[PDB]
PDB file of C-alpha atoms and ligand atoms in Angstrom:
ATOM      1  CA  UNK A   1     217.922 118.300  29.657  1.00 18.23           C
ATOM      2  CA  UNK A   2     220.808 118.255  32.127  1.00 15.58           C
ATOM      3  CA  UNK A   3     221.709 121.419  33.749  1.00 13.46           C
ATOM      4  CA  UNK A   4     223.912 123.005  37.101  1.00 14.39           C
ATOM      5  CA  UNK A   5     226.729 121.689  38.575  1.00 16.10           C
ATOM      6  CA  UNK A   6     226.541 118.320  39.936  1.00 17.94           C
ATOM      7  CA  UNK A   7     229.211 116.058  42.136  1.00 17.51           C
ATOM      8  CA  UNK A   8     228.888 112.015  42.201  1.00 14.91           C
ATOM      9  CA  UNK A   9     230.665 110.230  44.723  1.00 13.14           C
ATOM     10  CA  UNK A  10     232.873 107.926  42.276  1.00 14.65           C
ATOM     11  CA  UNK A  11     234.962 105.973  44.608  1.00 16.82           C
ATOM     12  CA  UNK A  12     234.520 102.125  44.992  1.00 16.72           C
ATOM     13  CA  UNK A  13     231.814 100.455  46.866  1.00 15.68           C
ATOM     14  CA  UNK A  14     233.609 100.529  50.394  1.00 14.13           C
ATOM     15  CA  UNK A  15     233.964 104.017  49.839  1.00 15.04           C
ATOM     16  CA  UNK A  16     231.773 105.641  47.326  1.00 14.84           C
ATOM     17  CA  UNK A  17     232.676 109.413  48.624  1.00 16.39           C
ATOM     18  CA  UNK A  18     236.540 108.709  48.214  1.00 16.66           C
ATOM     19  CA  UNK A  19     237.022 110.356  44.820  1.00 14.79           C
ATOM     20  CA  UNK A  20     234.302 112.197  43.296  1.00 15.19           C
ATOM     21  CA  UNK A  21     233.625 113.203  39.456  1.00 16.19           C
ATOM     22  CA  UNK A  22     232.061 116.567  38.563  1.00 16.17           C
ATOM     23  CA  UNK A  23     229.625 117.120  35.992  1.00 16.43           C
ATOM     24  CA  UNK A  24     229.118 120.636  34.401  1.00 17.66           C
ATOM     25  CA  UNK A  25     225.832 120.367  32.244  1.00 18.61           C
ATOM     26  CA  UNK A  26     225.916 123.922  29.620  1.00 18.12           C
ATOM     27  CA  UNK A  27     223.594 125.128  27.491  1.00 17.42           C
ATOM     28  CA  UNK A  28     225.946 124.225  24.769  1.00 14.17           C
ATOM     29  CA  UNK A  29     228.311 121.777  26.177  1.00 11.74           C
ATOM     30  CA  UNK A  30     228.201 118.886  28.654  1.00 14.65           C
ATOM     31  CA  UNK A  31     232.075 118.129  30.835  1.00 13.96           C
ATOM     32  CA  UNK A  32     232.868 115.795  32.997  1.00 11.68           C
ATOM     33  CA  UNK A  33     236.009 116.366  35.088  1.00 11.52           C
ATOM     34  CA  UNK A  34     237.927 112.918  35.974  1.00 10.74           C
ATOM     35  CA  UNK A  35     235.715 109.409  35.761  1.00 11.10           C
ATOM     36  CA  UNK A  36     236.139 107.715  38.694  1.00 11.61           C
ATOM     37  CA  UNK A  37     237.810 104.638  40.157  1.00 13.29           C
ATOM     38  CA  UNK A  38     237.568 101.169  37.774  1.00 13.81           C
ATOM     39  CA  UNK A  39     235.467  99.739  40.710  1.00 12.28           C
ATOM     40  CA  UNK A  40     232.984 102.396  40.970  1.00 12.75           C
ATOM     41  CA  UNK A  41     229.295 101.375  40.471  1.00 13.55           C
ATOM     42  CA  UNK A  42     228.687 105.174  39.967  1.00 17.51           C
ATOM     43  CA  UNK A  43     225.758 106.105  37.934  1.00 16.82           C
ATOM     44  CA  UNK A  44     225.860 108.876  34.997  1.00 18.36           C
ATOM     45  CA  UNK A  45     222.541 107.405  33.238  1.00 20.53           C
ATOM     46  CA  UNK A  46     221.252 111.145  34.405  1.00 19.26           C
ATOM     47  CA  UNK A  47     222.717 112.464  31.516  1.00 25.88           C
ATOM     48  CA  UNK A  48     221.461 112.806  28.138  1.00 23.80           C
ATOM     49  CA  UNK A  49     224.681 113.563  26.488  1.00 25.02           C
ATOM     50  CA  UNK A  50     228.617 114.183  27.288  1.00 21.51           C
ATOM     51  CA  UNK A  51     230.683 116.404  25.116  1.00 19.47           C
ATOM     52  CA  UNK A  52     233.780 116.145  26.714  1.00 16.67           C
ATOM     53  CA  UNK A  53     235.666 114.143  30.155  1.00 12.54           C
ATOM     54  CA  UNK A  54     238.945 116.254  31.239  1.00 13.86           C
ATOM     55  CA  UNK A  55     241.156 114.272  33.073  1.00 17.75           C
ATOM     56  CA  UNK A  56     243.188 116.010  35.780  1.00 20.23           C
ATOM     57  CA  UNK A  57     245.657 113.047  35.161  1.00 21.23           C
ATOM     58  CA  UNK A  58     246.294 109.748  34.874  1.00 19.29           C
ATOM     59  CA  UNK A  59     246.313 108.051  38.052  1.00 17.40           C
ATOM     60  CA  UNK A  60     244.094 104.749  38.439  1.00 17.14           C
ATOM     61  CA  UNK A  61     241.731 106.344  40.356  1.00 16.86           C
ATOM     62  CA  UNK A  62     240.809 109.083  38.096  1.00 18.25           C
ATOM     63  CA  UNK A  63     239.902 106.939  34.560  1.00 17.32           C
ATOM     64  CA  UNK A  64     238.579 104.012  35.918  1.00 19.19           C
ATOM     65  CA  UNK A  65     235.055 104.184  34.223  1.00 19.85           C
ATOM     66  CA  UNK A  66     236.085 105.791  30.750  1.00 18.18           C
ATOM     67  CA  UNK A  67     236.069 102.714  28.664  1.00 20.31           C
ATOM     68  CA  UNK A  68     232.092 102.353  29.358  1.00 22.19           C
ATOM     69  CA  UNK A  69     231.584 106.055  29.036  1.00 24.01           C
ATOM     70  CA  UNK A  70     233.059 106.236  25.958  1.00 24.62           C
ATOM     71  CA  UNK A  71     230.963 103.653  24.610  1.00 25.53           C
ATOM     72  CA  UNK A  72     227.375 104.969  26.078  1.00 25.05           C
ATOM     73  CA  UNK A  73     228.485 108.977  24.946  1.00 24.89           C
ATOM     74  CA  UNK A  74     229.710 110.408  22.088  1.00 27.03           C
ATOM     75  CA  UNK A  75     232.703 112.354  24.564  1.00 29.19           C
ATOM     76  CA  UNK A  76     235.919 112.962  23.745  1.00 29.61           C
ATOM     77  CA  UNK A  77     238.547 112.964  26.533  1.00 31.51           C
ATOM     78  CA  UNK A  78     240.899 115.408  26.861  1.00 29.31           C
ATOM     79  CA  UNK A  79     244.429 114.424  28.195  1.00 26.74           C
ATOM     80  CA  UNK A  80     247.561 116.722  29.181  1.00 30.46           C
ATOM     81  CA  UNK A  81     249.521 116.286  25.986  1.00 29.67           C
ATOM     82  CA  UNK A  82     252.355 113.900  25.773  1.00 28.29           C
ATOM     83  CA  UNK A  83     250.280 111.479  27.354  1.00 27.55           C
ATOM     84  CA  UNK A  84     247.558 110.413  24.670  1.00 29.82           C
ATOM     85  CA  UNK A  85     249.549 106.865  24.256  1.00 27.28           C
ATOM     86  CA  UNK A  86     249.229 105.768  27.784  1.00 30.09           C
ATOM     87  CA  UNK A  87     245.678 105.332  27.502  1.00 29.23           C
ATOM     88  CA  UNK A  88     245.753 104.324  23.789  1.00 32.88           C
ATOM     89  CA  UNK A  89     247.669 101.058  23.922  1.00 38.05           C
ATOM     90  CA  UNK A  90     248.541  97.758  25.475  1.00 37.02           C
ATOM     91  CA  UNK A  91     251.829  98.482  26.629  1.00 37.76           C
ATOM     92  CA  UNK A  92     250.515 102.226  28.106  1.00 36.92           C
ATOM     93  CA  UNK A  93     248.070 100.423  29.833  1.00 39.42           C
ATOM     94  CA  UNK A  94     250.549  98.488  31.534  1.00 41.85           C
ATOM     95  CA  UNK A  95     252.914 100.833  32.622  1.00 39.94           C
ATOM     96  CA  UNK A  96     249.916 102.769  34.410  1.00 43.69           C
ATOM     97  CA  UNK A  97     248.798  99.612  36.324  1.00 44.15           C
ATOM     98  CA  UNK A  98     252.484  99.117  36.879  1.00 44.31           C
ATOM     99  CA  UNK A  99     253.182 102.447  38.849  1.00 44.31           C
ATOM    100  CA  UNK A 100     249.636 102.291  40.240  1.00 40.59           C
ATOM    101  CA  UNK A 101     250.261  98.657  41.756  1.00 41.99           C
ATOM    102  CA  UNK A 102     253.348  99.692  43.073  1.00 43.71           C
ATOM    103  CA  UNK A 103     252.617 103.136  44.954  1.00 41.71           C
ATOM    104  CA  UNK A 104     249.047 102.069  46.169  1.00 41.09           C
ATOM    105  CA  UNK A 105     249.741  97.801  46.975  1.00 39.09           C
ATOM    106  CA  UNK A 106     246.555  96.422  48.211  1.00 41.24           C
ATOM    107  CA  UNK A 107     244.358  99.562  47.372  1.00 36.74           C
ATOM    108  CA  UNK A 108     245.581  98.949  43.758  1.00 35.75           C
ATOM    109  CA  UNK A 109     242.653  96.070  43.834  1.00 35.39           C
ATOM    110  CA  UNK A 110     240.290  98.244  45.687  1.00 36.81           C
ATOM    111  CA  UNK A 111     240.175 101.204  42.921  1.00 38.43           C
ATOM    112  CA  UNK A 112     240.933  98.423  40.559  1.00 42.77           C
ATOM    113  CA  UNK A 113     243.127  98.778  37.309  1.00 43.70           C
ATOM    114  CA  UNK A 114     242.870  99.936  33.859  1.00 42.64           C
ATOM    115  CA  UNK A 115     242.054  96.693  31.789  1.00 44.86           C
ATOM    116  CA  UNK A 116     241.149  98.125  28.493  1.00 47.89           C
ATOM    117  CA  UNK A 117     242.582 100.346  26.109  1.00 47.07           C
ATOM    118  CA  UNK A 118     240.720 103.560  24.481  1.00 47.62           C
ATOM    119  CA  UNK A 119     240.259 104.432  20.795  1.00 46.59           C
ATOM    120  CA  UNK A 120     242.812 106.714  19.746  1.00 46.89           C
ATOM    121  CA  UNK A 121     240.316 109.095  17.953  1.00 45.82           C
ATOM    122  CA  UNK A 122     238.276 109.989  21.236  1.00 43.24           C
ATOM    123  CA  UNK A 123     241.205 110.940  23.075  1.00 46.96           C
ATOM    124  CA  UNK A 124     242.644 114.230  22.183  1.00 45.91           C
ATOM    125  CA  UNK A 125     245.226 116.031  23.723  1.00 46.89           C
ATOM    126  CA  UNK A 126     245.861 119.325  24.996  1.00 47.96           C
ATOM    127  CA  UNK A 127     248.183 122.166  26.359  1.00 45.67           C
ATOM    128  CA  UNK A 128     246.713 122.677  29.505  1.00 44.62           C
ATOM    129  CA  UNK A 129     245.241 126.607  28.327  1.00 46.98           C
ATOM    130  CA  UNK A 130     242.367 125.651  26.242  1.00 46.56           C
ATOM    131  CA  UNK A 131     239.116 127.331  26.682  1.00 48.62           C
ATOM    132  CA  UNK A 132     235.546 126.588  26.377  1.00 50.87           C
ATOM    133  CA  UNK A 133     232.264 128.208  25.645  1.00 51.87           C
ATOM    134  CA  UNK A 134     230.069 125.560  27.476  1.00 50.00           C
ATOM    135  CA  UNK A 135     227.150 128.345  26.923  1.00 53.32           C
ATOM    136  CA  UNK A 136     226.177 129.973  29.634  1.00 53.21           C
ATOM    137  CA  UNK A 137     229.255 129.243  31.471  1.00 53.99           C
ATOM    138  CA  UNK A 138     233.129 129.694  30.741  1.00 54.46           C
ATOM    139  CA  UNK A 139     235.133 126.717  31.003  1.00 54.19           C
ATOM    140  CA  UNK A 140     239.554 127.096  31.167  1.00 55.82           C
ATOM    141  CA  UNK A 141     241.888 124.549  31.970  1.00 54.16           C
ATOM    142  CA  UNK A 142     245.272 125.168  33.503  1.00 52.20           C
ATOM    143  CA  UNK A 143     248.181 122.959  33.666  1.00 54.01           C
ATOM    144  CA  UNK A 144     249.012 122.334  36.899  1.00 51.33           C
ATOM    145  CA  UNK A 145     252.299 119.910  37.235  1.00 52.44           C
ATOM    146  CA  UNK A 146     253.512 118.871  40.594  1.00 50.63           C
ATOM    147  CA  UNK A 147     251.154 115.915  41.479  1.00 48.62           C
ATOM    148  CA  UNK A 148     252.296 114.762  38.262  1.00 46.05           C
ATOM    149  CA  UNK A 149     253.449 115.537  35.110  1.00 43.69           C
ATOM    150  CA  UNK A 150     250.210 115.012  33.589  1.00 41.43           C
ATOM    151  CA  UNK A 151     248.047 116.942  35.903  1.00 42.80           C
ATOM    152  CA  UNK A 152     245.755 119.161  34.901  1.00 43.21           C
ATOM    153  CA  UNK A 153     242.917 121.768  36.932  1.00 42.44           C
ATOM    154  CA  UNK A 154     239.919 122.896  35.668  1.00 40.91           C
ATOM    155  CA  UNK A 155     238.264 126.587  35.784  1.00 40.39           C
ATOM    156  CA  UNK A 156     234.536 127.140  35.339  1.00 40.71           C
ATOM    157  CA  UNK A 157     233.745 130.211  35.815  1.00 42.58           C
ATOM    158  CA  UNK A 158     234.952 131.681  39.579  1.00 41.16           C
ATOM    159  CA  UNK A 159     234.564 126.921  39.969  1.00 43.04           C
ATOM    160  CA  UNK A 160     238.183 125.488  40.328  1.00 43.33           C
ATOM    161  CA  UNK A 161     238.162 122.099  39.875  1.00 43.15           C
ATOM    162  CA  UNK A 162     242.180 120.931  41.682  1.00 43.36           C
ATOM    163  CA  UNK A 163     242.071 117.140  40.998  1.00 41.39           C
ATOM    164  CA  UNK A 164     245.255 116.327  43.197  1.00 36.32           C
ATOM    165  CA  UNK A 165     247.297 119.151  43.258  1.00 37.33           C
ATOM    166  CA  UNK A 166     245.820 121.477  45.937  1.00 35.61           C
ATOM    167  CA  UNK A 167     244.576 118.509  48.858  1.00 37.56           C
ATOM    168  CA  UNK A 168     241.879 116.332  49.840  1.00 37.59           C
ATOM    169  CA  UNK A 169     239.743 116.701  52.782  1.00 36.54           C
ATOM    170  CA  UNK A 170     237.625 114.501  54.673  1.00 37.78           C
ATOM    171  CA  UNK A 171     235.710 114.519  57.981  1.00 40.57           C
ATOM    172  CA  UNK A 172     237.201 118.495  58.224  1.00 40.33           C
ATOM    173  CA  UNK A 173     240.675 117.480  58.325  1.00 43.28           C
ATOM    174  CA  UNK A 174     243.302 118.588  55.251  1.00 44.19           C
ATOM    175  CA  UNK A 175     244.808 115.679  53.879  1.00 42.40           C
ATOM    176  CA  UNK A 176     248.156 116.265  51.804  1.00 41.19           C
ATOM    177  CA  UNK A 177     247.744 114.898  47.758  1.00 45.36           C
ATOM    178  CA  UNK A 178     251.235 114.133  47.880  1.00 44.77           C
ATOM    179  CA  UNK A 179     251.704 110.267  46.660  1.00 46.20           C
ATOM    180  CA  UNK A 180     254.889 108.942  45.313  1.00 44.72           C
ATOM    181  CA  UNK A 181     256.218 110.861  43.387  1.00 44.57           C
ATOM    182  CA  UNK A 182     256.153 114.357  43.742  1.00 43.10           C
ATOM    183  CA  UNK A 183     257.820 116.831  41.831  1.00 43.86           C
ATOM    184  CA  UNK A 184     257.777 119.250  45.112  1.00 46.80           C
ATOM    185  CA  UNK A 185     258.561 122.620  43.573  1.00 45.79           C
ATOM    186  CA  UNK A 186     256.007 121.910  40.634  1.00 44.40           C
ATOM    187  CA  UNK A 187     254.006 121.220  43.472  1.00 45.41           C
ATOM    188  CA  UNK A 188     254.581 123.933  45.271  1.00 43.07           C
ATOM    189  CA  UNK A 189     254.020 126.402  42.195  1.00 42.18           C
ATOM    190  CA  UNK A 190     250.599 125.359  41.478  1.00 41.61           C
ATOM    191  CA  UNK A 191     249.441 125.655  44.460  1.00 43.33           C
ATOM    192  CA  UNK A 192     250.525 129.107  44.947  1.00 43.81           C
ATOM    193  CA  UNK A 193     249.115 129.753  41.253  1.00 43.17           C
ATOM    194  CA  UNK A 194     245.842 128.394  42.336  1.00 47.80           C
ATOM    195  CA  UNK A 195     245.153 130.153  45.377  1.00 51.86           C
ATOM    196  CA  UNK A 196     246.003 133.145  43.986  1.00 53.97           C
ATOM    197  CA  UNK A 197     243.131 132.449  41.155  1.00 55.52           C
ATOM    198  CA  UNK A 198     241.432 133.153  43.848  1.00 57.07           C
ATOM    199  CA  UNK A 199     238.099 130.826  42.920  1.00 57.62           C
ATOM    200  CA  UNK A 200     234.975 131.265  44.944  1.00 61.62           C
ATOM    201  CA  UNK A 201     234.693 127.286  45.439  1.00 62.53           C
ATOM    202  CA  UNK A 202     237.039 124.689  45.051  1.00 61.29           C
ATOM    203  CA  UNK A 203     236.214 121.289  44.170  1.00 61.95           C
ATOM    204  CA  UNK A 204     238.262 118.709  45.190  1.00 60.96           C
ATOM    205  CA  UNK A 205     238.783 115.155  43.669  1.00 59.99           C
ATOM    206  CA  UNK A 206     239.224 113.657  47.121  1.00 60.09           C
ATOM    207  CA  UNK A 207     236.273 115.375  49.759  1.00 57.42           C
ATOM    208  CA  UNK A 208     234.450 117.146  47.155  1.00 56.44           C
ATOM    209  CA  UNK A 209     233.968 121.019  47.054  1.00 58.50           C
ATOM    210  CA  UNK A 210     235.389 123.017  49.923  1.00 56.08           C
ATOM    211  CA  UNK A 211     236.364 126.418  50.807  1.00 56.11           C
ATOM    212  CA  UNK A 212     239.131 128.022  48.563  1.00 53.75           C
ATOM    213  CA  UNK A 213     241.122 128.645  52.242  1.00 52.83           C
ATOM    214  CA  UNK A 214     241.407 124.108  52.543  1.00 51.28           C
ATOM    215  CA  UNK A 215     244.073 125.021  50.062  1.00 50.24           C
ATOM    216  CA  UNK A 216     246.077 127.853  52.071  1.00 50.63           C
ATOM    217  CA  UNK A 217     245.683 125.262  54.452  1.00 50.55           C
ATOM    218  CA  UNK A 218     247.424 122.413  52.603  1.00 50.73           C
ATOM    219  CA  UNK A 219     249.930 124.832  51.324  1.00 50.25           C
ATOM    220  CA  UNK A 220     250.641 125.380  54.934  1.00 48.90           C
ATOM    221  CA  UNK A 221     250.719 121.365  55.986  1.00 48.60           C
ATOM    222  CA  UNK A 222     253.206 121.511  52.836  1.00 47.93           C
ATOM    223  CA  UNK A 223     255.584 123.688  54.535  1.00 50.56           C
ATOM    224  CA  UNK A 224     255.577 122.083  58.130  1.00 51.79           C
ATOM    225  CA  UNK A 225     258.876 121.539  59.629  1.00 51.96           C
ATOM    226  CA  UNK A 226     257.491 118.649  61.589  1.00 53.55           C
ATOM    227  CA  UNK A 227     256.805 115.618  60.126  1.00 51.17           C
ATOM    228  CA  UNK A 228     253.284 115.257  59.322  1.00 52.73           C
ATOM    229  CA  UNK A 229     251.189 112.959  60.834  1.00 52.58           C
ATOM    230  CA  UNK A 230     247.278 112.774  60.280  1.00 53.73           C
ATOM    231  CA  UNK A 231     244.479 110.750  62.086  1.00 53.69           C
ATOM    232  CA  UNK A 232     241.277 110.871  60.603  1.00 54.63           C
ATOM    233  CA  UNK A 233     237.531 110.133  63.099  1.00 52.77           C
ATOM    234  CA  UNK A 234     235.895 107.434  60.505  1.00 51.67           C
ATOM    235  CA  UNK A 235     235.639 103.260  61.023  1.00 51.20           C
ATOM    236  CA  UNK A 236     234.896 100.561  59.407  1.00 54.49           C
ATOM    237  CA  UNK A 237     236.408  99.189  56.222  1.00 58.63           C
ATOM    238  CA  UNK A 238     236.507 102.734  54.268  1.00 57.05           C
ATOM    239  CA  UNK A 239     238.459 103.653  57.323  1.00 55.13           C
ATOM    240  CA  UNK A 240     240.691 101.554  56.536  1.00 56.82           C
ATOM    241  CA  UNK A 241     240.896 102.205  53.051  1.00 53.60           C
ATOM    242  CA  UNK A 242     241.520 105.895  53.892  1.00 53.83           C
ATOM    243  CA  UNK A 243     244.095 104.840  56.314  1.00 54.43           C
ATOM    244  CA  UNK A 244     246.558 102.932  53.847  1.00 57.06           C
ATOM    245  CA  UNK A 245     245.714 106.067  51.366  1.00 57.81           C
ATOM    246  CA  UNK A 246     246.862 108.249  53.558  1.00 60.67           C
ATOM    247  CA  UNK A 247     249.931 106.341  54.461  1.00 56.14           C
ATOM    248  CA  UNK A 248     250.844 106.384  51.025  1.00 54.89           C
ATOM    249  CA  UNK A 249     250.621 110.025  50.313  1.00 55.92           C
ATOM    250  CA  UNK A 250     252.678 110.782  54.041  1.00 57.99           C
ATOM    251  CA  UNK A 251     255.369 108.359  52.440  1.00 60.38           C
ATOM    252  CA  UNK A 252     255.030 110.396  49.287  1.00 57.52           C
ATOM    253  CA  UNK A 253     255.227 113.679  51.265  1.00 62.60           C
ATOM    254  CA  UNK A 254     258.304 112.401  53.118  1.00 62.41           C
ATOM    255  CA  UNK A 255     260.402 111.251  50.043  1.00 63.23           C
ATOM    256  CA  UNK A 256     259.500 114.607  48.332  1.00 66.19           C
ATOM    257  CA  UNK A 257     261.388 116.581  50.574  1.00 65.39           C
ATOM    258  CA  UNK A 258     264.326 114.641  50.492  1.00 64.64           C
ATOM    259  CA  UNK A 259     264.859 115.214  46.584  1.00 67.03           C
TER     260      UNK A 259
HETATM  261 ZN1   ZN B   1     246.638 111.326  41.937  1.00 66.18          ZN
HETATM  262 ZN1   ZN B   2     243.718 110.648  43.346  1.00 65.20          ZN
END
């Protein structure tokens, strides 16, 4: 059977390490935190089973691959609640790809958009303080607002698990998860309430685990008088793609403090 920890790159074929999902195999229970971006070609046929996929939140680039995991496994997904119905329905569905298409432009066809709706009975929706016995291990989540109003980290044991509210990282340089739009004190607050959980790894949705100190780090790039400006060492086309991301998120970062 499936067992450990183990972290797929999930990101789309130009850039498979761009986002990457987590999988927590238990002696009791099987998670799966965030699923991806719709154009991933990532592979999960490793597992036997999947008890549960907790969303961080609802961004495009986080539930891409959910309607064919919910049809291979018997999971249920587990949403911040208030949110269930934008996942459920037509017209949910199309005020995500909405606010994706207009905050990410051309990467909106990169990650590629939500096209089909999920059965109301394997979403379920919760506080953002549940916790799990995934046997062997202890599972918690913690509502984390800021990024958005639907985010949501994960806790497995000393394992935190930010999604986008504590930074990304790639090629060693700190990244800022601040798209359009932030709520910047929410922000702010989770961040702070994060590092001070004071995890032993962090795992983050964009440049996979890294040291719990990437996120003093970001908290720091949050606070910068100066504008920020980042250049990232990497070529080709996921270059590129990183390039217009992180233009976005600068933009995002920008705005925030004007509010
Ligand atoms: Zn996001
Ligand atoms: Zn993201």
């Amino acid at each position: 059977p499936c067992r450990g920890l183990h972290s797929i790159p999930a990101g789309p074929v130009e850039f498979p390490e761009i986002a990457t999902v987590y999988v927590m195999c238990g002696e009791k229970l099987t998670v799966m935190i965030d699923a991806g971006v719709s154009n991933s070609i990532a592979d999960f046929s490793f597992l036997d089973k999947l008890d549960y996929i907790v969303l961080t939140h609802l961004h495009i680039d986080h539930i891409g691959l959910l309607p064919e995991l919910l049809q291979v496994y018997k999971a249920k997904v587990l949403v911040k609640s208030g949110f269930k119905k934008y996942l459920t329905s037509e017209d949910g569905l199309k005020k995500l790809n909405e606010s994706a298409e207009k905050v990410l432009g051309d990467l909106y066809y990169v990650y590629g958009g939500l096209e089909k709706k999920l059965d109301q009975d394997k979403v379920i929706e919760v506080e953002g303080n549940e916790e799990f016995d995934l046997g062997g291990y202890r599972m918690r989540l913690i509502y984390t607002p800021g990024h958005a109003r639907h985010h949501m980290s994960v806790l497995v044991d000393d394992f935190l698990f930010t999604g986008d509210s504590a930074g990304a990282y790639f090629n060693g340089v700190v990244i800022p998860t601040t798209p359009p739009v932030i709520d910047y004190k929410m922000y702010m607050e989770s961040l702070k309430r994060q590092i001070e959980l004071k995890p032993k790894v962090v795992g983050f949705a964009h440049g996979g685990l890294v040291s719990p100190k990437i996120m003093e780090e970001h908290l720091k790039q949050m606070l910068s008088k100066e504008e920020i400006q980042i250049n990232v060492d990497i070529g080709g086309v996921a270059g590129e793609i990183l390039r217009k991301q992180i233009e976005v998120n600068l933009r995002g970062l920008r705005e925030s403090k004007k509010s």
